[PDB]
Amino acid sequence: PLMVKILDAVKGTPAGSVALKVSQKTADGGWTQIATGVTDATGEIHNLITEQQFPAGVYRVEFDTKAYWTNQGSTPFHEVAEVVFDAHPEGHRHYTLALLLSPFSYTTTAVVSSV
Amino acid sequence: CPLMVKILDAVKGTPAGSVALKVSQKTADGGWTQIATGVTDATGEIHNLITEQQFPAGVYRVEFDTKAYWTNQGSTPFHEVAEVVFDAHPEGHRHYTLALLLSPFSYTTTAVVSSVHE
Amino acid sequence: CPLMVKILDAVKGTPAGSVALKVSQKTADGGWTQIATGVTDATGEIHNLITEQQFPAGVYRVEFDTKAYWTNQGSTPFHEVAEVVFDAHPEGHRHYTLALLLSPFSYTTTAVVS
Amino acid sequence: CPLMVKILDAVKGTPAGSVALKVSQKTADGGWTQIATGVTDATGEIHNLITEQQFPAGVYRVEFDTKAYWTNQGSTPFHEVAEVVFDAHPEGHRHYTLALLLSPFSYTTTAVVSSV
Numbered sequence: 358p359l360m361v362k363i364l365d366a367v368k369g370t371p372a373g374s375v376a377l378k379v380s381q382k383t384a385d386g387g388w389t390q391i392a393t394g395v396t397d398a399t400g401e402i403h404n405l406i407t408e409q410q411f412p413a414g415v416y417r418v419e420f421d422t423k424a425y426w427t428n429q430g431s432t433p434f435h436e437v438a439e440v441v442f443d444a445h446p447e448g449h450r451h452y453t454l455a456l457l458l459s460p461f462s463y464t465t466t467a468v469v470s471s472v
Numbered sequence: 473c474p475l476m477v478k479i480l481d482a483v484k485g486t487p488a489g490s491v492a493l494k495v496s497q498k499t500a501d502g503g504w505t506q507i508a509t510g511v512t513d514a515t516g517e518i519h520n521l522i523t524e525q526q527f528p529a530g531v532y533r534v535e536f537d538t539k540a541y542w543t544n545q546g547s548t549p550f551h552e553v554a555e556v557v558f559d560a561h562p563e564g565h566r567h568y569t570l571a572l573l574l575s576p577f578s579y580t581t582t583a584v585v586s587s588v589h590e
Numbered sequence: 591c592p593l594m595v596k597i598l599d600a601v602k603g604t605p606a607g608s609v610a611l612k613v614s615q616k617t618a619d620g621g622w623t624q625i626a627t628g629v630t631d632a633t634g635e636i637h638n639l640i641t642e643q644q645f646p647a648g649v650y651r652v653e654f655d656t657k658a659y660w661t662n663q664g665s666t667p668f669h670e671v672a673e674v675v676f677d678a679h680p681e682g683h684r685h686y687t688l689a690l691l692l693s694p695f696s697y698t699t700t701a702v703v704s
Numbered sequence: 705c706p707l708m709v710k711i712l713d714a715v716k717g718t719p720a721g722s723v724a725l726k727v728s729q730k731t732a733d734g735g736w737t738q739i740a741t742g743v744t745d746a747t748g749e750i751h752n753l754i755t756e757q758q759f760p761a762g763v764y765r766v767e768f769d770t771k772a773y774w775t776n777q778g779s780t781p782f783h784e785v786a787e788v789v790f791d792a793h794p795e796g797h798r799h800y801t802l803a804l805l806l807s808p809f810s811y812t813t814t815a816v817v818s819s820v
């Protein structure tokens with residue numbers, strides 16, 4: 358239900374080996390960690406979470422972009438890239454978090470398949 | 473396919489369906505020759521746009537009718553058209569995906585030239 | 591004004607007016623302490639957000655209430671908020687401009703470090 | 705000035721200086737006539753690019769030499785050029801700012817229209 362696609366805007370390839378964590382907002386305004394992962398070479402993570410693990414609610418996906426640029430040899434601006442959103446996965450609703458990275462800029466977009 | 477597209481609608485949060493596009497190749501005299509046209513499907517893609525044989529190295533211009541897209545959406549767009557012009561280097565089984573993120577008053581054109589990082 | 595913002599609305603093609611934001615500084619224990627808040631004017635900027643005195647070297651978080659902005663505009667947006675987290679090195683009159691481009695289902699955060 | 709530009713370099717986190725550009729106006733026959741050329745300064749802008757008298761309503765094309773910008777940076781660019789094509793409606797003292805966000809394999813073209 359939750360997929361990601363991270364692209365490197367400098368190299369024109371997906372951003373591989375990007376560490377991420379998915380958190381779910383709790384009733385008291387806190388966060389609970391529901392999964393972690395690292396993108397494969399296609400800048401994707403497969404079987405990140407399952408349907409039952411992704412009920413309606415506010416989610417935060419944190420991407421370790423600083424480590425990504427460091428490893429690539431660039432010094433980046435952001436300490437992390439955070440994507441915080443409301444998810445309504447009722448039906449067939451699948452979410453793709455598209456992330457476009459440059460050392461001093463990123464774009465976070467979502468593609469939400471209907472039901 | 474050596475040339476793929478992926479168009480996203482940044483307003484609706486879905487791929488941009490029914491976007492008309494055309495692919496032209498720069499000729500020796502500096503003019504443009506149209507080699508393919510098409511319209512994106514519901515996934516914001518166009519399958520079998522051109523073949524490897526139709527894609528020798530050279531300068532290509534892919535023009536997207538984003539103005540009609542927004543107009544059909546009931547929106548007011550800025551750009552007359554979205555243009556992506558690039559020198560293609562297909563040697564070594566390099567394929568291109570032209571990613572395009574659309575908003576009425578903004579678009580982002582990115583290119584992916586491998587399916588994997590390195 | 592070591593810390594400036596410039597927010598644009600990619601749907602309307604104008605700056606994003608009345609966008610609420612808050613600036614937090616990371617503390618020794620890893621937590622966040624809020625040092626300023628503001629709301630963008632019609633040019634999508636906030637003047638005199640913080641002073642050089644308030645902006646020492648360290649890690650900062652600028653959080654923009656984009657959800658409220660889109661809700662007010664009449665759209666249902668994706669993001670609950672827009673978060674910009676960065677290590678600042680303002681020592682030496684280093685200015686930071688956080689440029690933010692907004693659409694209901696996408697935003698771009700860029701930095702111009704002068 | 706009815707037509708401004710603001711070019712940023714997303715790799716360095718600075719405006720993009722010394723970017724060459726050309727402004728053309730579409731003619732009645734579908735062709736193009738050049739009305740201005742310029743090069744951005746260190747703030748990624750070009751001052752006094754054209755006058756209001758030179759900017760009537762119509763379709764304009766602004767071509768940015770981003771390929772040379774990246775080549776000079778020692779990088780490898782994707783795009784052969786960056787072109788921004790739009791129907792301009794300056795009536796009622798509307799000015800345009802073409803914002804351009806550059807990375808080697810990606811750029812964002814946005815427009816800001818203000819009543820100034």
Ligand SMILES: N[C@@H](Cc1cc(I)c(Oc2ccc(O)c(I)c2)c(I)c1)C(=O)O
Pocket residue numbers: 362363364453455456457458468478569571572573580582584
């Ligand atoms: N196999 C599918 C996977 C796929 C999914 C999506 I959403 C894509 O678009 C992106 C992704 C990240 C970005 O930052 C931007 I801008 C656009 C691409 I490119 C590929 C396909 O090829 O469409």
Ligand SMILES: N[C@@H](Cc1cc(I)c(Oc2ccc(O)c(I)c2)c(I)c1)C(=O)O
Pocket residue numbers: 596598633687689690691698700702710711712801803804805806814816
């Ligand atoms: N802030 C001053 C000048 C100014 C105008 C604009 I539009 C700006 O935004 C940009 C520029 C390029 C980009 O690629 C992106 I995304 C945003 C900035 I930063 C500054 C003013 O307008 O008075």
